[PDB]
Every structure is written in structure tokens, then in C-alpha cells.
Amino acid sequence: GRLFTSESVTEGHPDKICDAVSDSVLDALLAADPRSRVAVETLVTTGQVHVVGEVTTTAKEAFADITNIVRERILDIGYDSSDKGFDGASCGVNIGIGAQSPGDQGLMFGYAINDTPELMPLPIALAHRLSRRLTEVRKNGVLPYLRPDGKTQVTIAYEDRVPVRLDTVVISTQHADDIDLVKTLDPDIREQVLKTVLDDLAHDTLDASAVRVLVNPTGKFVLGGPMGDAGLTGRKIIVDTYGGWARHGGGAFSGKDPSKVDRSAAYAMRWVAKNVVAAGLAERVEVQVAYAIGKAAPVGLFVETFGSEAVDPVKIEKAIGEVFDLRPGAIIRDLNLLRPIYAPTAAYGHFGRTDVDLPWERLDKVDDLKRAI
Amino acid sequence: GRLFTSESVTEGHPDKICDAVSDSVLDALLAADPRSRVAVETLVTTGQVHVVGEVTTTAKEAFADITNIVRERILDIGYDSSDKGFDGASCGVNIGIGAQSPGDQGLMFGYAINDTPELMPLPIALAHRLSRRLTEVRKNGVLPYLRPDGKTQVTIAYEDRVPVRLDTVVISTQHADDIDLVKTLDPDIREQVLKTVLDDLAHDTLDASAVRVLVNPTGKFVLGGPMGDAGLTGRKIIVDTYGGWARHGGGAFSGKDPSKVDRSAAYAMRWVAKNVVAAGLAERVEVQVAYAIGKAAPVGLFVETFGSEAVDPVKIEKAIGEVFDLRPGAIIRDLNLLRPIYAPTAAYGHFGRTDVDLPWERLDKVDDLKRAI
Ligand SMILES: [Ca+2]
Ligand SMILES: [Ca+2]
Ligand SMILES: [Ca+2]
């Protein structure tokens, strides 16, 4: 018997607003100048956004427009009124970004596991499915009374590595003041969010019949986002990745262009791990890549299969080194990373996404691995 | 045959400046009102500090003094001139903190391992020893030409879990513009920083005779800190903990009062794991604690010993449940957390410190565990 809990948040959570604004600036610059170098951090607090950092780009028009990119992103998230705690059209926006016209000892991790169709650990996969659906029923008008800020927590009970029970689900969501928590919110969330996600997943062993469901356990949640709070870019890196189930090297993703190895190699490592698992080489795998200063190619590639391998782990390591080219330049080319694809990654997780198609989630190396093992 | 790399940074690194400022504010508030509730975030970029968030406190004088607390912390770090890229006496300081007068589904981790006297993984333990000594030789006048910003990277080679070789050390440090990199910095850092740390540690198996040493491999490093950069609180959470060696639930520490379980329970988990290893019950251990909403005491406690246990892992779990009271109220009492002890934690790691005495590092439960096993 083990319990494992992971968490996700909606795009309206103040830290996630920051990640999305940072990545929205990044996408605007890449769309006009694919070689842009970008290190952009966002802060939010009551009624203000502060965007800072450094850019090297030829995309002068997009750079000029950053103030409008900020506002439009916030509006798209759904903050369009002080009654909601925040209004993208009228909040303060301050830009302190340095602008110009035109490496590491490292140990990066990737992970995949056959507990879900998307090959992610179940607690985080379910938490992200729930937070994404919470947003979906607001935006599609099914529960139009919802507001952007929200959080999901999923606790799974395991016996001998098998997920056997959905122990607890917590869903906190912002909403209009006049909504009855017990008569309206609780059954609507159970029906439109929890039940539809569980149906979608159709898990083979997860028994959800006795789940303890807590919807807004602390009561009314009328104001949200930056209101009476603060958020920063890169403060949800466990939410962005594997929900605590896998190890983390420490780099945040959002607001960084693909030349930042923190981002692109983390994406490659997910890609490698996912294809290893999808190929049938192991039921779960953590993949490690070792980099050296002055060398482009890795100096080490190590697999941990936690006893779950179907073949010698040393053979898996050799097959990876044969199939994948993990030089940064090769990664950037092969995953086609110099494109404005990043704003969608800034909430609901960078890995295992069921609603968007990301290059590092493609199972396009399964055949190659099978031929090389 | 495995490599592992971890990194540390000095108190002058821009992310760490933010953590230090956040915890300096926290300390000032706790010194006058131990019951203060604090969620304070700090951002820095070229020439400015922006401190935001929320506070509930009776410490009105301390709150009024926040602008001076900021400046004094930055001066203490060593930024006192535009020549260094930043001056605490004359930079921009903007305070946007809400102020007034007067739980979760969770799974937190702690880790310990017998690879160092401080019972921390060797790569991060050495990286922190190095970054701390780099600061020390600047402040004590031995290498007075150094400036605050700096970074260390340590790569260790392992054979069957034994640390056998110090593979690579990178030390990057800020310094005055008139310093010769080859004639001065290179041998000074090797002699005063690397050599002294390795002599201090006197490791039993780590062979350092063939170490690749890189001092400032990208050359001159004259401006630093926030200059031409940006930092935010809570962007070094892996540096703050186990250097990527252990799993992380996701919460940052700095700028949060001890009622934040993200902070206090992480500290108690380290305390638990450290006492387990010190008691000789396992050579390495990850301890996980599961909390439920509406319940003070944990609903689960799990021990992973990675095959290194001296006794049944299950007997270790039982002894922990008997010896430790992991209710947050108990943890705050027993570790005596409502005191201004946090500013020193904000750089060089929260765990495994050789230069300061922290309550969650005391081996005061080794005897208890031995009697309960
Ligand atoms: Ca809030
Ligand atoms: Ca293929
Ligand atoms: Ca810098």
C-alpha cells in the first residue's frame, strides 16, 4: 500500500499566468525571428504585471508590441474584470527587458511509464486532465459561471505498483459570487469535470467508486489570479513535468528560447523515455544524459528501469546512443524547436498532453529503437 | 560506470539575491511578530529590486523598514558599486506588498545518504562546500578582488554506487576587470577554494588526482548579479535541496513563513531521513509523507532504502511513526521554527550545511530511533 499525490493548476493560477505571458513573448519573437535569444521572466501581483529580462532579436515590431501581447494573453485566459480580481485591459503593465540586435557540465532526466495512454505517471496525468477540462467547460460555455483560477489534486492508492483506487480528488475553482456551492458547484464539477475525465481515461485498474471528492473545500472562491497574491515565471516546474514522480535537474522552461539546454534537452529526454516505453523495452524508465563543457555530444547516457525492463538495461542505453543524436543543434533541428509553439505548453503540463501535439511526444522513434535493440 | 553532476551558486547569483531578500524580510517580521504570515516574492533585474506578495503581521515598524532591509541585505552580499554591476545603496527598490493586521492533499520527500559527513549526496555537498568557500575567501580578504556572483559544478564518477573519481570541477566567479585570468584567478581558485575544500572533506574513496578543473571557462566575468540578467525568488529549488539526486514535490522555501507546509514539512522530512541514516538503519533513504485534507497527522509514511537497509524497511517506517510527530503544529514546536533563522538558509543549500547549525540537521533522534527499532 502506497499513496501518491500530484497537483495541477489552470492557466488562471497566478504562477501559470506568468509562465504563459513569458512564453507568449517568446512565441511573438520567434515567429518573426526564429534565431531570437530570449530570457524573459514575468511577475504578477494585485493589479500589475512586471516583465523583465533580456532579448537579442531582429523582431523589433514584435518587441514593440510586448505590452499588447501581455494584455491579450491575460484577456484570453479570461481575466477581463476587476470583479474577477483582475482585468487584462486595465491592469498595470511594466516592461523592464534589455534589448539588443545580434557550455555546461549537465545531468538531465526524462521519464515515461505505462500507467496511462499518454505514458505519464497517473497522479499528474489525471491532475492535468482535470485542470484542462475545468478550463474547457468554462470556455465552451457548459459551466459559464466559472472563472479562470483553479487547482486540482489527485491522490492514487497503489498496491505492488498497480494503481488500484482513486483515493481523493480536490478541485478548487474560481466562480461567480451567486453560485450555490452545494446545490450547483459540487454536482456540476463532479459531472462535467471529474466524470467526463474518468470516462475519457477509461483506466483498466483504477477503481474510482469510493473516491473522496472535495470541490472548493475552503468555500467561496470569487476573486482570483494575482488578486491578493503574487505569481512568478518558473515556480511550477514540478507541475510542468512529472508531478513529483520523477527526478528534476532544476531548470524552469517558460520564457527561454530553445538554445537553453534546460528546456530543449529536458524535452529530448522526455522524447527518449517515451519511445523507450512505447517500444516495449521497459514498463517504466528514467533516462539520464551527461554533458561535458567543450563537447557537443553527451559523455554518458544512463537508463534506470526500476526492475521493469524487458531487455538488458545496458542494451537500452546502447540503442539510445545509436538512435538519438542528443547534440543541442541536432535536438533543435529534429524536434523543429525554432517555431512559435510554446505558449500552449505554459499550462496543463509540458509532457503527456492529450489536447495538443508536441514534437517531443511523438512516438516516431519506436521503430528505430526496435531495430537497434 | 555512472556520472552525476550537481551545481551550487553563491549568494550573489541573481536568483539567490531574491531568496535572500525574501527571507531577510521574513526574519525581520518574525523577530518582532513570531506569528506573522508571510508570502513575499522578490524579483531583480538591471538596477532594480521589486518585492511583492502578502503579509499579515503586528510588526509594523519592521514592515515600514523593508526598503532598508532590502538595501542592507544587498550590500552585505557585496554589491556596493555600479562597477560590480549593482549597488545596494543606490539601486531601484519598489515594494508592492499587501499588508494587514491579524489543509492540502500532499506528499513531501526527505533524503539522506552516507557519502559525506553531512549525510548529503556527494555532488551537491561538494558543490555547496565550494560555493560557500568561494564566498568566504572574498569576504575574509584572502582573494579581495573577487565579486559576489559565482557558480560551481561538480561531476562525480561512480562504480557500483561507490564515488570513485572527482571527474570535473567548474568554478565560475565574478572578479575585478584588472585581474589576469591565467596568472591570478586560475591558480588562486585552485589553491584557495578547490584545494582547501577537498582537504576539509578528506573523502575516503574520492580520487581527485585526475580532476578536470575549469575556472571561468567562458573568460572574463566582471559584471554580475542582476546586471544584464534577471532573478526571482524560488528559482533554485534543486540547488536548495538535493541537487537532482532526490525527488522534489515542487514548493520553493524562501519568503514563506513556517505555517507553509511546503517549507516546514520538507525540513522535517530531511530531519527524519538524516536521523535514519545516522542511526545506521540504511546507508541511503528517501522518506515520503502523505497528508490528507481535514487531518493533522500524516495518513501515510513510506521509506525507500534502495536495497541499502540494515533492517527491514517496514521496521524503519514503524520506528519513524513512533518517534516523530509529523503534525505541522508539532513540527513547528519541535524544530522551534518561529524565529528569525531563515536568511542564512537562502544560499548554500537548506540541507547538509557545514557552516551553520539548523534544527532539521540535528542528530537528536538517533537514540530514539535505535530504541524503537
Ligand atoms: Ca490566491
Ligand atoms: Ca522512425
Ligand atoms: Ca548573469
PDB file of C-alpha atoms in Angstrom, chain A residues 176-372:
ATOM      1  CA  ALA A 176     -19.345  33.909  -9.776  1.00  0.00           C
ATOM      2  CA  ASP A 177     -20.478  35.122  -6.307  1.00  0.00           C
ATOM      3  CA  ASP A 178     -24.127  33.981  -6.577  1.00  0.00           C
ATOM      4  CA  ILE A 179     -23.347  30.278  -7.193  1.00  0.00           C
ATOM      5  CA  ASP A 180     -24.588  27.754  -4.605  1.00  0.00           C
ATOM      6  CA  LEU A 181     -21.574  25.641  -3.607  1.00  0.00           C
ATOM      7  CA  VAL A 182     -23.594  22.572  -2.521  1.00  0.00           C
ATOM      8  CA  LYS A 183     -26.572  22.619  -4.934  1.00  0.00           C
ATOM      9  CA  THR A 184     -24.788  23.816  -8.125  1.00  0.00           C
ATOM     10  CA  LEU A 185     -20.960  23.810  -7.986  1.00  0.00           C
ATOM     11  CA  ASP A 186     -20.365  20.415  -6.372  1.00  0.00           C
ATOM     12  CA  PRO A 187     -22.618  18.319  -8.664  1.00  0.00           C
ATOM     13  CA  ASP A 188     -21.673  20.299 -11.857  1.00  0.00           C
ATOM     14  CA  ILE A 189     -17.936  19.788 -11.224  1.00  0.00           C
ATOM     15  CA  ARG A 190     -18.424  16.068 -10.363  1.00  0.00           C
ATOM     16  CA  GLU A 191     -20.488  15.574 -13.555  1.00  0.00           C
ATOM     17  CA  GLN A 192     -18.871  17.872 -16.118  1.00  0.00           C
ATOM     18  CA  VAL A 193     -15.222  17.651 -14.990  1.00  0.00           C
ATOM     19  CA  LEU A 194     -14.457  14.580 -12.854  1.00  0.00           C
ATOM     20  CA  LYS A 195     -16.843  12.050 -14.518  1.00  0.00           C
ATOM     21  CA  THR A 196     -16.012  13.118 -18.098  1.00  0.00           C
ATOM     22  CA  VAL A 197     -12.226  12.890 -17.461  1.00  0.00           C
ATOM     23  CA  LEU A 198     -12.578   9.427 -15.815  1.00  0.00           C
ATOM     24  CA  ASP A 199     -14.688   8.290 -18.849  1.00  0.00           C
ATOM     25  CA  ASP A 200     -12.040   9.649 -21.248  1.00  0.00           C
ATOM     26  CA  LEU A 201      -9.223   7.835 -19.460  1.00  0.00           C
ATOM     27  CA  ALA A 202     -11.152   4.529 -19.073  1.00  0.00           C
ATOM     28  CA  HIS A 203      -8.437   3.122 -16.800  1.00  0.00           C
ATOM     29  CA  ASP A 204      -8.127  -0.708 -16.543  1.00  0.00           C
ATOM     30  CA  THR A 205      -7.464  -0.994 -12.783  1.00  0.00           C
ATOM     31  CA  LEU A 206      -8.224   2.372 -11.174  1.00  0.00           C
ATOM     32  CA  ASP A 207     -11.387   1.924  -9.085  1.00  0.00           C
ATOM     33  CA  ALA A 208     -12.902   5.389  -8.578  1.00  0.00           C
ATOM     34  CA  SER A 209     -16.164   4.238  -6.940  1.00  0.00           C
ATOM     35  CA  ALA A 210     -15.172   5.299  -3.371  1.00  0.00           C
ATOM     36  CA  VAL A 211     -13.229   8.476  -4.314  1.00  0.00           C
ATOM     37  CA  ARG A 212     -13.361  11.260  -1.722  1.00  0.00           C
ATOM     38  CA  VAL A 213     -14.273  14.326  -3.818  1.00  0.00           C
ATOM     39  CA  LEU A 214     -13.656  17.774  -2.362  1.00  0.00           C
ATOM     40  CA  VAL A 215     -14.929  20.656  -4.516  1.00  0.00           C
ATOM     41  CA  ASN A 216     -13.897  24.067  -3.112  1.00  0.00           C
ATOM     42  CA  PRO A 217     -13.087  22.662   0.343  1.00  0.00           C
ATOM     43  CA  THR A 218     -12.327  26.188   1.647  1.00  0.00           C
ATOM     44  CA  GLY A 219     -15.680  27.653   0.398  1.00  0.00           C
ATOM     45  CA  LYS A 220     -16.396  30.648  -1.884  1.00  0.00           C
ATOM     46  CA  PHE A 221     -13.632  31.402  -4.435  1.00  0.00           C
ATOM     47  CA  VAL A 222     -14.837  34.597  -6.106  1.00  0.00           C
ATOM     48  CA  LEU A 223     -11.698  36.692  -6.573  1.00  0.00           C
ATOM     49  CA  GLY A 224      -8.600  35.042  -8.002  1.00  0.00           C
ATOM     50  CA  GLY A 225      -5.480  35.223 -10.117  1.00  0.00           C
ATOM     51  CA  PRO A 226      -2.930  37.837  -8.966  1.00  0.00           C
ATOM     52  CA  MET A 227      -5.522  39.472  -6.624  1.00  0.00           C
ATOM     53  CA  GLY A 228      -4.188  39.386  -3.051  1.00  0.00           C
ATOM     54  CA  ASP A 229      -1.475  37.036  -4.216  1.00  0.00           C
ATOM     55  CA  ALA A 230       1.643  37.009  -6.378  1.00  0.00           C
ATOM     56  CA  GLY A 231       2.948  34.781  -9.167  1.00  0.00           C
ATOM     57  CA  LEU A 232       6.292  34.319 -10.928  1.00  0.00           C
ATOM     58  CA  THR A 233       7.574  32.513 -14.015  1.00  0.00           C
ATOM     59  CA  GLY A 234       9.157  29.118 -13.324  1.00  0.00           C
ATOM     60  CA  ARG A 235       7.508  28.468  -9.920  1.00  0.00           C
ATOM     61  CA  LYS A 236       5.561  25.383 -11.142  1.00  0.00           C
ATOM     62  CA  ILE A 237       8.395  23.234 -12.556  1.00  0.00           C
ATOM     63  CA  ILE A 238       7.126  20.011 -10.909  1.00  0.00           C
ATOM     64  CA  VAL A 239       3.599  20.688 -12.255  1.00  0.00           C
ATOM     65  CA  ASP A 240       5.256  21.334 -15.683  1.00  0.00           C
ATOM     66  CA  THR A 241       6.999  17.951 -15.637  1.00  0.00           C
ATOM     67  CA  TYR A 242       6.106  14.701 -13.764  1.00  0.00           C
ATOM     68  CA  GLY A 243       4.238  15.779 -10.591  1.00  0.00           C
ATOM     69  CA  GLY A 244       6.995  14.682  -8.207  1.00  0.00           C
ATOM     70  CA  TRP A 245       7.047  11.116  -9.525  1.00  0.00           C
ATOM     71  CA  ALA A 246      10.377  11.628 -11.362  1.00  0.00           C
ATOM     72  CA  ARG A 247      13.636  13.446 -10.509  1.00  0.00           C
ATOM     73  CA  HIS A 248      14.283  17.060 -11.656  1.00  0.00           C
ATOM     74  CA  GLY A 249      17.527  18.905 -12.529  1.00  0.00           C
ATOM     75  CA  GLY A 250      16.020  22.284 -11.607  1.00  0.00           C
ATOM     76  CA  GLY A 251      15.676  24.462 -14.718  1.00  0.00           C
ATOM     77  CA  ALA A 252      12.352  26.166 -15.499  1.00  0.00           C
ATOM     78  CA  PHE A 253      11.067  26.118 -19.120  1.00  0.00           C
ATOM     79  CA  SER A 254       8.919  29.194 -19.844  1.00  0.00           C
ATOM     80  CA  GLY A 255      10.405  32.421 -21.242  1.00  0.00           C
ATOM     81  CA  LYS A 256      13.526  30.613 -22.561  1.00  0.00           C
ATOM     82  CA  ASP A 257      14.304  30.090 -26.245  1.00  0.00           C
ATOM     83  CA  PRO A 258      15.329  26.504 -27.391  1.00  0.00           C
ATOM     84  CA  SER A 259      19.093  27.290 -27.145  1.00  0.00           C
ATOM     85  CA  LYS A 260      18.651  26.981 -23.361  1.00  0.00           C
ATOM     86  CA  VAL A 261      19.613  23.342 -22.725  1.00  0.00           C
ATOM     87  CA  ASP A 262      17.402  23.454 -19.551  1.00  0.00           C
ATOM     88  CA  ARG A 263      14.447  23.405 -21.924  1.00  0.00           C
ATOM     89  CA  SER A 264      15.435  21.637 -25.142  1.00  0.00           C
ATOM     90  CA  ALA A 265      17.347  18.730 -23.512  1.00  0.00           C
ATOM     91  CA  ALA A 266      14.569  18.218 -20.970  1.00  0.00           C
ATOM     92  CA  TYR A 267      12.174  17.921 -23.958  1.00  0.00           C
ATOM     93  CA  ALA A 268      14.567  15.497 -25.757  1.00  0.00           C
ATOM     94  CA  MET A 269      14.841  13.379 -22.584  1.00  0.00           C
ATOM     95  CA  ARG A 270      11.029  13.057 -22.407  1.00  0.00           C
ATOM     96  CA  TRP A 271      11.076  12.075 -26.068  1.00  0.00           C
ATOM     97  CA  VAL A 272      13.700   9.363 -25.498  1.00  0.00           C
ATOM     98  CA  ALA A 273      11.974   7.953 -22.406  1.00  0.00           C
ATOM     99  CA  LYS A 274       8.539   7.854 -24.028  1.00  0.00           C
ATOM    100  CA  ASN A 275       9.808   5.993 -27.093  1.00  0.00           C
ATOM    101  CA  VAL A 276      11.720   3.503 -24.878  1.00  0.00           C
ATOM    102  CA  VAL A 277       8.493   2.676 -23.041  1.00  0.00           C
ATOM    103  CA  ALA A 278       6.268   2.713 -26.162  1.00  0.00           C
ATOM    104  CA  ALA A 279       8.777   0.324 -27.813  1.00  0.00           C
ATOM    105  CA  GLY A 280       8.168  -2.295 -25.041  1.00  0.00           C
ATOM    106  CA  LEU A 281      11.752  -2.049 -23.761  1.00  0.00           C
ATOM    107  CA  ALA A 282      10.592  -1.322 -20.160  1.00  0.00           C
ATOM    108  CA  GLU A 283       7.325  -0.654 -18.323  1.00  0.00           C
ATOM    109  CA  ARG A 284       8.842   2.495 -16.697  1.00  0.00           C
ATOM    110  CA  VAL A 285      12.153   4.308 -17.315  1.00  0.00           C
ATOM    111  CA  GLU A 286      14.124   7.291 -16.076  1.00  0.00           C
ATOM    112  CA  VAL A 287      16.689   8.316 -18.686  1.00  0.00           C
ATOM    113  CA  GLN A 288      19.796  10.340 -17.713  1.00  0.00           C
ATOM    114  CA  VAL A 289      22.039  12.321 -20.067  1.00  0.00           C
ATOM    115  CA  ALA A 290      25.501  13.552 -19.014  1.00  0.00           C
ATOM    116  CA  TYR A 291      27.008  16.589 -20.789  1.00  0.00           C
ATOM    117  CA  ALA A 292      30.582  17.953 -20.624  1.00  0.00           C
ATOM    118  CA  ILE A 293      31.795  21.568 -21.238  1.00  0.00           C
ATOM    119  CA  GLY A 294      33.503  21.860 -24.651  1.00  0.00           C
ATOM    120  CA  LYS A 295      31.858  18.739 -26.100  1.00  0.00           C
ATOM    121  CA  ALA A 296      28.560  18.803 -28.042  1.00  0.00           C
ATOM    122  CA  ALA A 297      27.630  15.095 -27.768  1.00  0.00           C
ATOM    123  CA  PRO A 298      26.781  13.513 -24.376  1.00  0.00           C
ATOM    124  CA  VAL A 299      29.615  11.831 -22.493  1.00  0.00           C
ATOM    125  CA  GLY A 300      27.202   9.451 -20.747  1.00  0.00           C
ATOM    126  CA  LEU A 301      23.734   8.025 -21.280  1.00  0.00           C
ATOM    127  CA  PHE A 302      22.233   6.031 -18.383  1.00  0.00           C
ATOM    128  CA  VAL A 303      18.918   4.211 -18.045  1.00  0.00           C
ATOM    129  CA  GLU A 304      17.126   3.253 -14.826  1.00  0.00           C
ATOM    130  CA  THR A 305      14.321   0.756 -15.360  1.00  0.00           C
ATOM    131  CA  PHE A 306      13.436   0.046 -11.685  1.00  0.00           C
ATOM    132  CA  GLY A 307      13.383  -3.730 -12.345  1.00  0.00           C
ATOM    133  CA  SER A 308      10.746  -3.244 -15.085  1.00  0.00           C
ATOM    134  CA  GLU A 309      12.915  -3.908 -18.191  1.00  0.00           C
ATOM    135  CA  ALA A 310      12.083  -6.461 -20.904  1.00  0.00           C
ATOM    136  CA  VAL A 311      15.717  -6.428 -22.050  1.00  0.00           C
ATOM    137  CA  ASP A 312      19.119  -5.758 -20.520  1.00  0.00           C
ATOM    138  CA  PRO A 313      19.212  -2.044 -19.450  1.00  0.00           C
ATOM    139  CA  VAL A 314      22.764  -1.774 -20.873  1.00  0.00           C
ATOM    140  CA  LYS A 315      21.298  -2.764 -24.284  1.00  0.00           C
ATOM    141  CA  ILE A 316      18.694   0.038 -23.871  1.00  0.00           C
ATOM    142  CA  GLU A 317      21.481   2.566 -23.202  1.00  0.00           C
ATOM    143  CA  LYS A 318      23.357   1.369 -26.340  1.00  0.00           C
ATOM    144  CA  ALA A 319      20.216   1.519 -28.503  1.00  0.00           C
ATOM    145  CA  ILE A 320      19.524   5.100 -27.315  1.00  0.00           C
ATOM    146  CA  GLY A 321      23.076   6.234 -28.181  1.00  0.00           C
ATOM    147  CA  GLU A 322      22.642   4.735 -31.654  1.00  0.00           C
ATOM    148  CA  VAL A 323      19.161   6.071 -32.437  1.00  0.00           C
ATOM    149  CA  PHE A 324      19.195   9.530 -30.885  1.00  0.00           C
ATOM    150  CA  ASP A 325      21.513  12.441 -31.599  1.00  0.00           C
ATOM    151  CA  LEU A 326      21.496  14.487 -28.414  1.00  0.00           C
ATOM    152  CA  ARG A 327      23.737  17.324 -29.526  1.00  0.00           C
ATOM    153  CA  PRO A 328      21.727  20.577 -28.854  1.00  0.00           C
ATOM    154  CA  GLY A 329      21.858  21.531 -32.547  1.00  0.00           C
ATOM    155  CA  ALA A 330      20.535  18.132 -33.587  1.00  0.00           C
ATOM    156  CA  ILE A 331      17.773  18.284 -30.956  1.00  0.00           C
ATOM    157  CA  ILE A 332      16.685  21.759 -32.093  1.00  0.00           C
ATOM    158  CA  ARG A 333      16.547  20.606 -35.753  1.00  0.00           C
ATOM    159  CA  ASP A 334      14.911  17.204 -35.137  1.00  0.00           C
ATOM    160  CA  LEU A 335      12.172  18.461 -32.792  1.00  0.00           C
ATOM    161  CA  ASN A 336      11.849  21.567 -35.025  1.00  0.00           C
ATOM    162  CA  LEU A 337      12.072  23.891 -31.983  1.00  0.00           C
ATOM    163  CA  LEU A 338      12.554  27.317 -33.677  1.00  0.00           C
ATOM    164  CA  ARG A 339       8.840  27.940 -34.138  1.00  0.00           C
ATOM    165  CA  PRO A 340       6.202  29.759 -32.079  1.00  0.00           C
ATOM    166  CA  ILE A 341       4.860  26.600 -30.353  1.00  0.00           C
ATOM    167  CA  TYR A 342       5.481  27.457 -26.673  1.00  0.00           C
ATOM    168  CA  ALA A 343       2.556  29.409 -25.250  1.00  0.00           C
ATOM    169  CA  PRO A 344       0.349  26.246 -25.268  1.00  0.00           C
ATOM    170  CA  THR A 345       2.997  24.422 -23.148  1.00  0.00           C
ATOM    171  CA  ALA A 346       2.802  27.058 -20.368  1.00  0.00           C
ATOM    172  CA  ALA A 347      -0.147  25.407 -18.581  1.00  0.00           C
ATOM    173  CA  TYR A 348      -1.526  21.821 -18.233  1.00  0.00           C
ATOM    174  CA  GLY A 349       1.999  20.377 -18.375  1.00  0.00           C
ATOM    175  CA  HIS A 350       4.782  20.225 -20.976  1.00  0.00           C
ATOM    176  CA  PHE A 351       4.619  16.394 -21.065  1.00  0.00           C
ATOM    177  CA  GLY A 352       1.918  13.837 -21.825  1.00  0.00           C
ATOM    178  CA  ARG A 353      -0.520  16.324 -23.339  1.00  0.00           C
ATOM    179  CA  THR A 354      -3.782  14.858 -24.701  1.00  0.00           C
ATOM    180  CA  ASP A 355      -5.112  18.158 -26.153  1.00  0.00           C
ATOM    181  CA  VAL A 356      -2.092  19.374 -28.213  1.00  0.00           C
ATOM    182  CA  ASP A 357       0.501  17.673 -30.419  1.00  0.00           C
ATOM    183  CA  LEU A 358       4.061  18.447 -29.257  1.00  0.00           C
ATOM    184  CA  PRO A 359       7.174  17.187 -31.137  1.00  0.00           C
ATOM    185  CA  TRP A 360       8.788  15.562 -28.048  1.00  0.00           C
ATOM    186  CA  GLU A 361       5.625  13.459 -27.508  1.00  0.00           C
ATOM    187  CA  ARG A 362       5.725  11.761 -30.926  1.00  0.00           C
ATOM    188  CA  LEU A 363       6.346   8.018 -30.978  1.00  0.00           C
ATOM    189  CA  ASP A 364       8.410   8.410 -34.176  1.00  0.00           C
ATOM    190  CA  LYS A 365      11.487   6.566 -32.777  1.00  0.00           C
ATOM    191  CA  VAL A 366       9.753   3.340 -31.625  1.00  0.00           C
ATOM    192  CA  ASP A 367      10.612   1.510 -34.869  1.00  0.00           C
ATOM    193  CA  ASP A 368      14.239   2.783 -34.737  1.00  0.00           C
ATOM    194  CA  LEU A 369      14.684   1.528 -31.150  1.00  0.00           C
ATOM    195  CA  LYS A 370      13.227  -1.920 -32.026  1.00  0.00           C
ATOM    196  CA  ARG A 371      15.643  -2.232 -34.962  1.00  0.00           C
ATOM    197  CA  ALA A 372      18.599  -1.213 -32.754  1.00  0.00           C
TER     198      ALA A 372
END
